[PDB]
Design a protein around this ligand. Structure first.
Ligand SMILES: [Fe+3]
Ligand SMILES: [Fe+3]
Ligand SMILES: [Fe+3]
Ligand SMILES: [Fe+3]
Lengths: 169, 169, 169, 169
């Protein structure tokens, strides 16, 4: 047993490893959308940049969990990173609806994992997830929702071009 | 009864006073290690400086609890500060193992006291301890653990000299 | 058929996707080594930083291939990313030997893919791989080889500690 | 026989003169599109600026071949520059489709000429074309292709006006 370990349950630890894989899956999907919108027959560089940055943030989320695992005395165990669901992602509106459901999926995995820690009375881990994970998801979901509403307002064609310019700046 | 007092249980208050004394005990032990490594027959100024700073942080921890006690309407009641366990602390590796067990002791006293506050539904006090106490202990324990692992890697003699240079910068 | 496509053979295209997956696999193994050395019972932060940066570079390599794929009119197709071979990586010297064999694996794949492009007379793709991929692998293999030679010179114990300081500074 | 000449085949030399004329023809067509969009009944100053710059780049490409010709010991021989194919170029989307087919024509000629040099084992000339000509054509074709995709997204009318602002800014 690790010399750090104090108040850190086996179940919390494996949840972290589960969530790490979840973040990496999010990162992989976002990265696929990014280069999907870089395609010459899509050509939406603002959407492309928005998802590339979303990707880099999910990967940052994952490494902080890895860092946390070590801080508490857990051990990182990595699984395969499953490829994204689709190879093509449709219109800009389509990919953002996928993004919303993705972020909500991640939020649920995080809310479940907060439950494990509260159950085991892991107060520090609860605050860790409150401060560094749950608040980001709430902002991320609201922001993507706003995007969805705007993409429906402007419609297709010129409207989708104009919103892409908005993500590009 | 204090005009501040709201949602602050008698048991939470006396736990604070208990923890204050615990922090001061930590400060006193660290201060003893600091000047132990300042001895001419020990002469490890980097270890000396590491523990002197650890001491100053524990004392800062204690005064913030005193400040908190007053914020909530409690009353600070101070007890004797028991002298440290040992007068001499052995090698640099030895004193860090003592430090780890010390920090873990403090972490347990804090985790227990978080339980009192959660039990009394003292949400504000839980966040106070999450934000300002529990996260520091997790970082402090991990950092001391790393030190222990390194002190075993470099061994005694020149290796302990080299690590002391690392704490001195 | 993409309006971009000119002189871009379907076999070259599928190799890019192949190499993309290989780079991502390299990235994943380095990420694993990085947080392996961040463990409290390993505690080699220099080695940890070296592999975290190596990780970030492989992902950079992968995104430039995705970018290239789109430039030539190909289409990115992502596969799973297989978990790294090991969960623990031993000593600093051990993980570097793995890194050399990893880099050589990546170099071999890149060399094979340069063959596919020269066969199809894809001159631009050859220079792309020459300029942005083959030169880095040669430098990377040599640098890791130097690291291996040095880690054997200093031996274990204090010597592995000293080299970790060299990777950190 | 030039005192420079080494490993420079007469067929490579005559191809350079061939390509010089091709670059100048590209330059001339872009110059025509530029002032086509400066017409008061077209009035697309962004498109006009984009093609004026494209014009200036092709002439730059041509002068570097003349410069190269002299470096290797060849001799520049200039032919007529044929008027552009059209006098009017239609919509912004139309002229970009012409531009893509133009760039691909130039790319094809450059690829053929790279073949002539590799056959004659003119390694330096291959890298010259790889470094200074083939990479730019790949980027140019992709950028124009992106433009084509966007001009179809925004449609005509306001959409063509908005994209013109994007090329102007
Ligand atoms: Fe995330
Ligand atoms: Fe403390
Ligand atoms: Fe690589
Ligand atoms: Fe040109």
């Amino acid at each position: 047993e690790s010399q750090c370990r104090q108040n850190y349950h086996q179940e919390s630890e494996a949840g972290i490893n589960r969530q790490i894989n979840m973040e990496l899956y999010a990162c992989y999907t976002y990265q696929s959308m990014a280069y999907y919108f870089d395609r010459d027959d899509v050509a939406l560089p603002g959407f492309s940049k928005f998802f590339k940055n979303s990707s880099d943030e999910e990967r940052e989320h994952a490494e902080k969990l890895m860092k946390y695992q070590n801080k508490r005395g857990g051990r990182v165990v990595l699984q395969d990173i499953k490829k994204p669901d689709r190879d093509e992602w449709g219109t800009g509106l389509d990919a953002m609806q996928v993004a919303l459901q993705l972020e909500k999926t991640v939020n649920q995995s995080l809310l479940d994992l907060h439950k494990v820690a509260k159950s085991h009375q892991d107060a520090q881990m609860c605050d860790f997830l409150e401060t560094h994970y749950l608040e980001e998801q709430v902002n991320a979901i609201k922001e993507i929702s706003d995007h969805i509403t705007q993409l429906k307002r402007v419609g297709s064609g010129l409207g989708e071009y104009e919103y892409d310019r908005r993500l590009d700046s």
